[PDB]
Amino acid sequence: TEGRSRDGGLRLGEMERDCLIGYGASMLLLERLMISSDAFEVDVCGQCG
Amino acid sequence: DDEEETYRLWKIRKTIMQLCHDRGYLVTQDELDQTLEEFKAQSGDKPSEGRPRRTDLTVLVAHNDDPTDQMFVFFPEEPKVGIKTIKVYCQRMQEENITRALIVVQQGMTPSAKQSLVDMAPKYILEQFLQQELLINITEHELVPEHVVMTKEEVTELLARYKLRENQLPRIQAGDPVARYFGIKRGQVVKIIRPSETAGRYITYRLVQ
Amino acid sequence: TEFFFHTMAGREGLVDTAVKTAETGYMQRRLVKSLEDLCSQYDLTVRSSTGDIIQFIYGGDGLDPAAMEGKDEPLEFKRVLDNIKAVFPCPSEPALSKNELILTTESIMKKSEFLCCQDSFLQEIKKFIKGVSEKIKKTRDKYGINDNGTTEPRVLYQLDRITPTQVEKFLETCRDKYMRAQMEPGSAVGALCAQSIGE
Amino acid sequence: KRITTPYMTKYERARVLGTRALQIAMCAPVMVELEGETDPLLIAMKELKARKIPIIIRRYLPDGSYEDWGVDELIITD
Amino acid sequence: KEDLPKVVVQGIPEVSRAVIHIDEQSGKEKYKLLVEGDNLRAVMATHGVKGTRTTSNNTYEVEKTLGIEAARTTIINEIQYTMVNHGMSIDRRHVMLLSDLMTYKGEVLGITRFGLAKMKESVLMLASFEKTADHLFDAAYFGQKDSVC
Numbered sequence A: 001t002e003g004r005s006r007d008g009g010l011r012l013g014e015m016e017r018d019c020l021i022g023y024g025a026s027m028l029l030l031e032r033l034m035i036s037s038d039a040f041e042v043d044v045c046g047q048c049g
Numbered sequence B: 001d002d003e004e005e006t007y008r009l010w011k012i013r014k015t016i017m018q019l020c021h022d023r024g025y026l027v028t029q030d031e032l033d034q035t036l037e038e039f040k041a042q043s044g045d046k047p048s049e050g051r052p053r054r055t056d057l058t059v060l061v062a063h064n065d066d067p068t069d070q071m072f073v074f075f076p077e078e079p080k081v082g083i084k085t086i087k088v089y090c091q092r093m094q095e096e097n098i099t100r101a102l103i104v105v106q107q108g109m110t111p112s113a114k115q116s117l118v119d120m121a122p123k124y125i126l127e128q129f130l131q132q133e134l135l136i137n138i139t140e141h142e143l144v145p146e147h148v149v150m151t152k153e154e155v156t157e158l159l160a161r162y163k164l165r166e167n168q169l170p171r172i173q174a175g176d177p178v179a180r181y182f183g184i185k186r187g188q189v190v191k192i193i194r195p196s197e198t199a200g201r202y203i204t205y206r207l208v209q
Numbered sequence C: 001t002e003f004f005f006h007t008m009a010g011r012e013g014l015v016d017t018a019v020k021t022a023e024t025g026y027m028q029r030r031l032v033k034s035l036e037d038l039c040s041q042y043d044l045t046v047r048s049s050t051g052d053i054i055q056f057i058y059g060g061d062g063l064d065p066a067a068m069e070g071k072d073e074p075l076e077f078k079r080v081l082d083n084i085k086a087v088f089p090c091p092s093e094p095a096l097s098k099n100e101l102i103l104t105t106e107s108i109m110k111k112s113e114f115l116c117c118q119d120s121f122l123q124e125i126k127k128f129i130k131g132v133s134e135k136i137k138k139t140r141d142k143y144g145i146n147d148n149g150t151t152e153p154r155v156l157y158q159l160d161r162i163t164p165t166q167v168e169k170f171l172e173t174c175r176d177k178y179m180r181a182q183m184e185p186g187s188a189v190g191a192l193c194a195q196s197i198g199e
Numbered sequence D: 001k002r003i004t005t006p007y008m009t010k011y012e013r014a015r016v017l018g019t020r021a022l023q024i025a026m027c028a029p030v031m032v033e034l035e036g037e038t039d040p041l042l043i044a045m046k047e048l049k050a051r052k053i054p055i056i057i058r059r060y061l062p063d064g065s066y067e068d069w070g071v072d073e074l075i076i077t078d
Numbered sequence E: 001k002e003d004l005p006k007v008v009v010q011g012i013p014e015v016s017r018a019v020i021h022i023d024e025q026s027g028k029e030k031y032k033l034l035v036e037g038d039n040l041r042a043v044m045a046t047h048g049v050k051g052t053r054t055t056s057n058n059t060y061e062v063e064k065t066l067g068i069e070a071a072r073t074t075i076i077n078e079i080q081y082t083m084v085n086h087g088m089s090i091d092r093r094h095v096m097l098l099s100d101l102m103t104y105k106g107e108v109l110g111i112t113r114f115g116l117a118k119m120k121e122s123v124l125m126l127a128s129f130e131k132t133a134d135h136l137f138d139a140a141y142f143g144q145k146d147s148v149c
Ligand SMILES: [Zn+2]
Pocket: A045, A046, A047, A048, A049
């Protein structure tokens, strides 16, 4: 959620997604942005796409 | 009159002939070391002789490998060259059976003539210029390095080394001055010899489009 | 009057701070958004996501700026030679003349491990050692210092004292440093370039 | 014959230590002896210094070829 | 009658002004010419000028007159010259890279929404940057596939 008034934690804007690439780390970026934050699972059909 | 104009004619002869020499076609040093005054001795005068054919050349056979390949050099005196003049020089080229023709015009080209200069004859090439461009040779400038055209075997060696496909190289375009300077047909590679802050020459290869 | 003029200048200085950073931000975003992809590979070329070459060799030399001790240069041989001199002040070894210097270095550089090095670097160290040889010649000449090692004022030999062990140590450490200044394959050169241009 | 550099890069150090830490966190076999250690990553750095790690990096060139190097066999440094 | 006085009679139509800059250093206390105008070809059309030693600050001018290689060197030169002119240091490798990127396509492609379209191919990074809906609809029109690369 948004911020302290409503329990939102922190925001990690674009300008830190840039420094993560700068260092070149990949598993850190992947974790921090999709594992920890909002990971989810979906289902697809290969035949139709 | 027009002392500058006479000097310009001298200098265009100088530069065009140096270019053709660098391209490998028949030229000799005694011709290269000609002087403006010697050129005056050869030619008449700007008012007395004019723009037409007085000291131009077509001796430029492919002395490099096979003189049968040759260039015309034409100096159309009209400021604007029209399609009919294109026909005149087309029949000149066809009659002489010469494969190439370097054309220089004073004040440019008509749209029909401009259009024709891309479709006149697939067998023939009639590279076009104006006197202004030829007043200097771009190769002499500081801001450009030397180049070489590479033969298919050398290209094969390079692409084998790094295991590329020619489309993966850097690009150069046919319209670039140096490209026209050497008449490089598209689908080729030239080596670039970049200077450096140290003796180490930077070498790199670039594909023409 | 002066107070008002001075405050007029102060606010003028103040007002640019945020605007300059706005323009800096729209440098940063649009740059890195275009240049972040470029990566440096194990063959040392720089290739796009489509795999097409951009630079045949990164940086013309394959060396990370993070290693340059000199002005965009990996070494300062004066400093290195002084450092090695200090740590190993062996008194037993003899002094060497220009001839000894050149023959000693030639005896060593011909080793293959050096031949694995960039030729340019080898030639440059050759020039450095040649220059120091010329200077030591100058010194011994100005004091006619006998190479036989027999003159009474032993101090005269301390002037430009160097020893073959020192030569070996200096050359090997130079090789070590040069080798460890290379860029490592996998590094994201584009992002670092973008931030370097932006900051 | 192998062409790539004989040193290990920063990134290889990072990923090998990371993956071996993940493994060691689970009940995978361990070789270096431990002085009351409790954290996976410390076990990882101990082994790496000991050159005990059971991993081979398969470097990839852009054209699909590859090399292999033994972690015990690369040049390592602090 | 009011129009005729404006007509050009002599000189370069495209030139605005020039000046003979003069120097005093011990190496040479001599003079040098500085020009403002946007036809580099024109000035070298003259006798007297050492045309082989000319230079135009404009990138497009050099590209037009000398070719892409001169344009590339001028880009690196100008970035570095402006930066030191202020007083910054920046390792030359970074700026060398950035120089080549702009010109690998056989043409100087600036960092712009137009340059980006002419330089990248994948869809999402276009859609993320600018002109999103236009790119999206045109992509659906073309039926473009897109790899996750
Ligand atoms: Zn389905």
